[PDB]
Amino acid sequence: EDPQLLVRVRGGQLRGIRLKAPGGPVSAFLGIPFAEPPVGSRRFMPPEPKRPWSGVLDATTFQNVCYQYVDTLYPGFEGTEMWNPNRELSEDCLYLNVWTPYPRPASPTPVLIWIYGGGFYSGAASLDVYDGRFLAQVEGAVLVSMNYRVGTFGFLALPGSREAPGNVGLLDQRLALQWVQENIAAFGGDPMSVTLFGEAAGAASVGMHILSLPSRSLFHRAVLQSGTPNGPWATVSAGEARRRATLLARLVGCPNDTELIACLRTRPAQDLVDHEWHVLPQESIFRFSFVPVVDGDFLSDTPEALINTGDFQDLQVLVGVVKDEGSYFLVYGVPGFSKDNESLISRAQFLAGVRIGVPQASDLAAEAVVLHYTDWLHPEDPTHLRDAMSAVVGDHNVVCPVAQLAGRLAAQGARVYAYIFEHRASTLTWPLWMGVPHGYEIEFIFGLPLDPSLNYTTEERIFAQRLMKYWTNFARTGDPNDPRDSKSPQWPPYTTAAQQYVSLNLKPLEVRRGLRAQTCAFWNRFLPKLLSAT
Amino acid sequence: EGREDPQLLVRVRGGQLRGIRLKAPGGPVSAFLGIPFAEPPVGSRRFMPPEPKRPWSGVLDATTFQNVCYQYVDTLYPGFEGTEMWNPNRELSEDCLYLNVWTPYPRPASPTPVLIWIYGGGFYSGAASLDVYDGRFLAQVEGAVLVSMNYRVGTFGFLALPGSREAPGNVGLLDQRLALQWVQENIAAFGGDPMSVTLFGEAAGAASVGMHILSLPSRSLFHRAVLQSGTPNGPWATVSAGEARRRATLLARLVGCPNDTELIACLRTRPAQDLVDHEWHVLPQESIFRFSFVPVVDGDFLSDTPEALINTGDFQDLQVLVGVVKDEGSYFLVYGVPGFSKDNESLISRAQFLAGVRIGVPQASDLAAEAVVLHYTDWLHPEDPTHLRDAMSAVVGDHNVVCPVAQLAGRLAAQGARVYAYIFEHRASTLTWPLWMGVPHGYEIEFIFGLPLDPSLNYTTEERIFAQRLMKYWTNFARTGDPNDPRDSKSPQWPPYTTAAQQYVSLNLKPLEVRRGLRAQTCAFWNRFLPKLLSA
Ligand SMILES: CCCC(=O)SCC[N+](C)(C)C
Numbered sequence A: 001e002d003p004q005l006l007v008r009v010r011g012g013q014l015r016g017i018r019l020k021a022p023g024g025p026v027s028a029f030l031g032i033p034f035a036e037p038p039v040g041s042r043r044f045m046p047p048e049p050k051r052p053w054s055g056v057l058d059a060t061t062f063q064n065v066c067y068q069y070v071d072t073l074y075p076g077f078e079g080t081e082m083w084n085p086n087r088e089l090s091e092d093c094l095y096l097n098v099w100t101p102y103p104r105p106a107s108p109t110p111v112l113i114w115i116y117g118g119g120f121y122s123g124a125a126s127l128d129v130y131d132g133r134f135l136a137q138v139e140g141a142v143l144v145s146m147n148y149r150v151g152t153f154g155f156l157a158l159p160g161s162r163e164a165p166g167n168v169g170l171l172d173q174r175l176a177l178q179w180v181q182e183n184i185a186a187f188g189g190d191p192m193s194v195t196l197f198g199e200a201a202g203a204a205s206v207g208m209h210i211l212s213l214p215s216r217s218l219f220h221r222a223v224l225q226s227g228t229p230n231g232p233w234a235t236v237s238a239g240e241a242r243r244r245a246t247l248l249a250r251l252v253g254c255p256n257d258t259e260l261i262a263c264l265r266t267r268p269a270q271d272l273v274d275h276e277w278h279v280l281p282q283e284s285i286f287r288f289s290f291v292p293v294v295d296g297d298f299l300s301d302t303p304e305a306l307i308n309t310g311d312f313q314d315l316q317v318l319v320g321v322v323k324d325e326g327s328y329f330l331v332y333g334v335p336g337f338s339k340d341n342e343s344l345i346s347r348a349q350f351l352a353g354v355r356i357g358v359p360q361a362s363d364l365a366a367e368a369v370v371l372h373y374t375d376w377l378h379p380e381d382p383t384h385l386r387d388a389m390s391a392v393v394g395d396h397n398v399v400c401p402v403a404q405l406a407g408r409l410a411a412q413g414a415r416v417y418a419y420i421f422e423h424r425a426s427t428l429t430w431p432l433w434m435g436v437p438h439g440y441e442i443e444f445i446f447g448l449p450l451d452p453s454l455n456y457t458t459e460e461r462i463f464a465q466r467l468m469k470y471w472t473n474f475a476r477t478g479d480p481n482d483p484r485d486s487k488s489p490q491w492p493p494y495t496t497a498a499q500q501y502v503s504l505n506l507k508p509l510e511v512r513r514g515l516r517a518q519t520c521a522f523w524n525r526f527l528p529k530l531l532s533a534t
Numbered sequence B: 001e002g003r004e005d006p007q008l009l010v011r012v013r014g015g016q017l018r019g020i021r022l023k024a025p026g027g028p029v030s031a032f033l034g035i036p037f038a039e040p041p042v043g044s045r046r047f048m049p050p051e052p053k054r055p056w057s058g059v060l061d062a063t064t065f066q067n068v069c070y071q072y073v074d075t076l077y078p079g080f081e082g083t084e085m086w087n088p089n090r091e092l093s094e095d096c097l098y099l100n101v102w103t104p105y106p107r108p109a110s111p112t113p114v115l116i117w118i119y120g121g122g123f124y125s126g127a128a129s130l131d132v133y134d135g136r137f138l139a140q141v142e143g144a145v146l147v148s149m150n151y152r153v154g155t156f157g158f159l160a161l162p163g164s165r166e167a168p169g170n171v172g173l174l175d176q177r178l179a180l181q182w183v184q185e186n187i188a189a190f191g192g193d194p195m196s197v198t199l200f201g202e203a204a205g206a207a208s209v210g211m212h213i214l215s216l217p218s219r220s221l222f223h224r225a226v227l228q229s230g231t232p233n234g235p236w237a238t239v240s241a242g243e244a245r246r247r248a249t250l251l252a253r254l255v256g257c258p259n260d261t262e263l264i265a266c267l268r269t270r271p272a273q274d275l276v277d278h279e280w281h282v283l284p285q286e287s288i289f290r291f292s293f294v295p296v297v298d299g300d301f302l303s304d305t306p307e308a309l310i311n312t313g314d315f316q317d318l319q320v321l322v323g324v325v326k327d328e329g330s331y332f333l334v335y336g337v338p339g340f341s342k343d344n345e346s347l348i349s350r351a352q353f354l355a356g357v358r359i360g361v362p363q364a365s366d367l368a369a370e371a372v373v374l375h376y377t378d379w380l381h382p383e384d385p386t387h388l389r390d391a392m393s394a395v396v397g398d399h400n401v402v403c404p405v406a407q408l409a410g411r412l413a414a415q416g417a418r419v420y421a422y423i424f425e426h427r428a429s430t431l432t433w434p435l436w437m438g439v440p441h442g443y444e445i446e447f448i449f450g451l452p453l454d455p456s457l458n459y460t461t462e463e464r465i466f467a468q469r470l471m472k473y474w475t476n477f478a479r480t481g482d483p484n485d486p487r488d489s490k491s492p493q494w495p496p497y498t499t500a501a502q503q504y505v506s507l508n509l510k511p512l513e514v515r516r517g518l519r520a521q522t523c524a525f526w527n528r529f530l531p532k533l534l535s536a
């Protein structure tokens, strides 16, 4: 028995496993329960803290993935399967993972907490791209990641009901956060320095914790990668959640909220997932059925209302986008688009893809979108039409929501740093036309290219090392700049006036001004006026 | 008594004329100024279509310019060259229907291509007698026969009670058409070729050219057309029958005239100056680049809207040259936008910008106006007074001239025409307008007419070489339907404008440069989106 691999936490003893990382050993503690399994009558309910255990709990292995839809668009294809569940599916999934340096850090170390994405309908802390070993070994970080409930199980709401109050997947995340405060010191973590970070739905989750008071006493800094609490996909109204939950209940034969929810509890997990996608009001892409709900509790108003009116003066935020946020999503519903060809579309196909990409758009607003993204020098060129369709989806769903958030936080006294991620991995299996798709910066931030067996280039290892530094420098200090290394250019803070951000690629940092400024004025200032008059 | 210059005595349908031998840098030219082409439209003939001039006896002296048509005279900056050069330079009178002819001296032996000029001035002003419209240089250097006519403006030209007999509308256009008929019958007496006639005009002159293209009885009177900074389509060049009736009866009320016969009869008893004094009071909004009395869609001269006629016409047999200057709008800003002046740099605020947009785009609802503002803001420096000043100029420029031109070039090209497109980018060294105004509306004209060739005018040597170039493009086009010099292969070519390639050339001191797309992105907003936005 290795004594470095034994830890006493409040609920009892744990045994971890020593992992090798290219530069040396790390301690992993995998599959630690942080809550009572949310099963049977506990389905749809706020999580309860895990009861203590006797003896030494085996924490050498990943636990089950929360029950979720499994992707079947391209069976066997690495570019999709890499996001699919890599352990067994179970409703019993409230577990977290901790990586630390080996030996256990002598003094308290900044803690990074990862929250995965998956549109609130999927994800798992156990995926290869979320491997905490590299950041633990190189930067000396304590990395934590949790499972949280997705789809119906995490976000089905009958607002105002005691038995399905909404947002329980966020409350799972909150409980893991409280677990870190109570327990991370035992691992050599510093509970007084906790940085949240996430991508996509995970970034929106981080944003929601910023906007929810009881969560604010559990972290100090935040990183939001390609996702925001504001925007078209991240929240629903109470009225709209009620509709979807009762619609899903009709689809599975149920049944007075008590009656309805009691009947939903008798249903096998897969019965619920089977119909999960049949409750959306429109034919759409980048929209998900069960997401955080504006309940007047976890979220006391809309993310929009809360970001305009908040005080973020003692807050540091790192925020950014990848180069081609929307390309990924096009193949999941827009006619004319596939990974197996060049996807050169017609104008007809472009107009029709806009209605699906902006499902809430009226006739007028859609043509405003089309007219705005057309190249009037080459109105019918199939390459521009394809790239523009990709741009429509990325801008509406990520880039412009991100620009809006960055501006509001900076204005409201926060310290903001912004980026665009432009390097496409040499090992990427998606076609070239997709460029740098939603999700493909994660493997670099986590430092995977340092594994020589993964076949990344030498340049990409040096790059991964740069990014791992910006991220942990940010966690340590609230500033991603190397505090003892000189060299201009420095990464400047994002401000509403200058709007400075940096590009992250193989070349040294470049400072740019204005994050799709003209285009986002269309989505953030004009389009709302056009809909609030139809 | 037969001691006068044998080369200055010419006979026309109406009788004998005596012209004058003028001096031009390269040699003498022949000028026949103030030839009457219509009965004077006075008294019971006010508002009425023109009647052909009745023949005179003996030799009519045609050695001086005639009266300028009664009109509003500019008083914004009195004594200032920038405005005075456009002001009337002869007595104002309703007796004003005269044309002018310039020809080589001696008159050419072989039939010579004819250029006809139609002046601008918003349909409320202008005169063929102004220094910038001097035909002597095109006549001497290019051997051209040049003709310019006076036509009625303001109320006298365009006040209309549509449907009536006594004031049918578009009579100023009918003056222009009568002078075109006069050229057909008479120009051969001067050595001109009636079978090669090219119309050309700037601003409202350009729009007039365009209306002659769209009006059937005019089409047989000319062969080629040049439209400078103006178009028959767009927001200012025409009005509906209903709106023209509205403006006419309002004018009547304001001057003491409270059945159309009765109302027109009372209008005809008012002094000319009273009508002018009240002209501007009938505009529906506070505005710039809008004029009270313009061509009307009467179902007669214009069988439908200019917009409809360019969309459905067959233009296979048409050659057209069209273009714009670099800063079409800047001129108009000092005549009504709070914040703007010729005597300072006119740096403005956001508030002043939004306020100016309501004036510059007077027909816009609140939604459309924020569309304009949001589109023209630079969101990296949304409060920079220099950018805001320039965007304001661009808004008015784009909406009134540049995008109507782009629509015109596109529709004619799609409908079979041969179109050549330019942007004129050279600021005259002699300009008295402040630098911020760039190259304003109207300041290519002096170059096309070759004024820099006159040494007493203080233009630079490069400006002479440049004026000579443009005179060649313009007259090659008149001659052949093609601006390019058949000999010169080394010189860069001017390609036709098409829908697929959208090619046009820059006109400056440097050799021709081909650019693609005529404010394509921005003009898509004005021509495609805005209409659809105003339809709700
Ligand atoms: C270049 C156009 C000049 C005018 O609009 S004149 C109008 C001036 N006023 C309204 C005072 C009569």
Ligand SMILES: CCCC(=O)SCC[N+](C)(C)C
Pocket (backbone or CB within 6 Å): B390, B435, B436, B437, B438
């Ligand atoms: C006072 C010099 C400014 C100019 O060059 S005026 C033309 C403005 N703009 C270049 C924006 C069209």
